[model samples]
Target: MKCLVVGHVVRDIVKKGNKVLERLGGGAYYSALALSRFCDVEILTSFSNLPEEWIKELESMAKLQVVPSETTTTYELTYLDGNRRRLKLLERASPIEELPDGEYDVLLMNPVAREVPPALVTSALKKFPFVAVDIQGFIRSSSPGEIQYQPIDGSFLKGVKILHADLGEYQYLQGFSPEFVDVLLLSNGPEPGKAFLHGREYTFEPVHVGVDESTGAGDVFLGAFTGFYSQCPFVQALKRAAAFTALFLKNRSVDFSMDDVNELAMKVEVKRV
Candidate 1:
């Protein structure tokens, strides 16, 4: 399967208590990395000053198409006491205007910033057979350079096949119904969350793991779900993706195989809510 991830590759300056970490981050990067294990992955992004190391790293894993921009999207993640984390946008990239010509089995739109226009979503809905989205990109406000949640208008999600959002972000995207999309996935960090598959409510549990800096877990979850869903059962995809994300949290990479996910999925309990 050919998978396309449309968003910006970002630079993450993470301040974890006393340690400072510079990481190559973004929904496009992480999601593409996860899908690369199961499909032919391609990334559509706009950024500048992305380290040659990351560029080559992503290129080695998947096909990379970059649209040049004056700035790259950047974030500052500060972990505080009581496990609270703060995210602030440091830079904004240009809106992704160009769409590459190709046939894709899965189209994932997971914008960290509001760089992806809604018109692009409309176009993808018309073009792709399976469209998945992480609504975090559309519902965040970058005003004053601090991350804030702005309630999203549901119209932004028309024709989306699958929608993934954090519980916090989902609150902002209120008028959208789970039935509106084929599957609606809501994650609440390590907490067990519910999924609405074709309007039927189901609850899924997370596998406990030694989590370090879990910055892109949600993005990876959506990527795993969409990738696995392309070939497996929907509920099985949820279980496998849950198991897949648990290993990603601990291992911090996509080194595991379908066999690994299958073993872990047996332990990830899922039930009808």
Candidate 2:
């Protein structure tokens, strides 16, 4: 399978207490890895002054396109706890004005800093067979140093096949865009996550474990869902994705495998909500 991730790659400065770690991250970075495990991954992004090592490492996982920008998008993550973190936007990248020139089996739209335009989402719907979008970036507003959540008119999600959003985003979006939602996925922290498919609600119970960081759990979940959904049924894909996300959050280990996800997925319960 060929999977395309549309978003910007960011340089992250993560500070948990006194320890500081600088790394490359963002929706495009995290989702690309998750999809890479199942398919040929490619990233469409714009950044400048990215470390050569970061570029090489990303290229090892996926085909990359680097659009010129004055600076790469950057964010500072201050972890308050395992699941809660305060974000400060340091810089923003240029908006994406071009689409990748290729055929993709699946498209994951995950703009980290609202760099992706809504027009591109509509265009992708016309072009791709399967598309999943993370609605966080669209619902988030970034000032110089802080990121805030804002209410969105859900019509922006029209023609989306799979819609991924946090619990708060979903609650606000539920009031609009009745014609657009096909599969609605709502993630509620460590609690049971819910998916509305074919007008029926399916609840996926999450299994929690210890972990060092939970920064990219949502992105991973979107990628895992899209990857598995390419081959499995919707309910099965949700179960596996949730289970995989739980395993990722708890372990945070480098040697995660699909077999591990498959084994843990057996313990996950999916029920009609």
Candidate 3:
């Protein structure tokens, strides 16, 4: 099994006290690791000429196929509270004009730094077998200098199958309800992951635990959820996704193994991280 994560990659400068922790995190990169639990992973991204020190640390763990563009997306993050993030786009990469040709089982379009053009999604849907999306990038924009929210039209999501959105983003995407929403995933920070399919809501409460950082919980959750849900029962897959996210939160901005996630999937409890 093979999965292709098509989106922008960024080097995140995490501001903790006076110390600076730089890591590789883009929606797709974070999501790819969770997908890697079940399938081989490939990332399609463009990067600027960066010193190895500025490179996202996760590249060491996954196979990154660079697009060799002149600009790479970058961000400086200040976390005032454990969960509250203040984002600054340090740099922006050029637009992705084409999709790399390959046989992809799961095609994930997670964009950052720019509105992922509908053309990209349309192209992928025409070529790939399965497609999933997170609308954070499309509904968000840093206008010249300021970060602001805007409405994303329905046509933007024409090619998407598995659509994940936060509560706010869902309102921004569709005012009432559009068509072709196969799997709708809604997450409210610490709230459980809710799935809406065929006008039915399937709620999965997370078995949370104590943690130092909850930074990438949603990204991991979406990633792991998509990775497993396609193969197992929806409830079982949701458990796997929720449990894996708990592990990431407990570990901070670190990567864990499939054995760890699978182990916790067996022990389901309603706790918080």
Could you tally the backbone clashes for each prediction? 0, 0, 0
Model 2 per-residue lDDT tens digits across residues 1-273 = 788898999999998888999988898888887888899998989898888899888899999877788978999999888778888999988888777767798888999888887788878888787778998777777556798877767776776778888886676563554336678788877878888885578788878776656888888888888888877988888888888788767654324878888888888889986
- Pairs of residues at least 3 apart in sequence or in different chains that clash in candidate 3: none
Query: Please, what are the lDDT tens digits per residue for candidate 3 over residues 85-109?
Result: 7777877776766777887888888
lDDT at position 252, candidate 1: 71
Provide the lDDT at 216 for model 1. 83
Cα deviation at 153, candidate 2, in Å, is 1.7
Candidate 1: tens digits of C-alpha lDDT, residues 1-273: 788999988899989778998999999988887888888998999888888888888898788788878888898888773225788998888888767778888899989888887788988888787788999888888564779888867876867888998887888886778888988999887788888888999999898776657878889999988888878888899999999888887777678777988999989888887
Clash-forming residue pairs, model 1: none
Q: Give the TM-score of candidate 1.
A: 0.96
lDDT of 3: 0.71
Candidate that would win on lDDT: 1
Model 2 RMSD in angstroms = 1.9
| Best-matching candidate per TM-score | 1
Q: How many backbone clashes does candidate 3 have?
A: 0
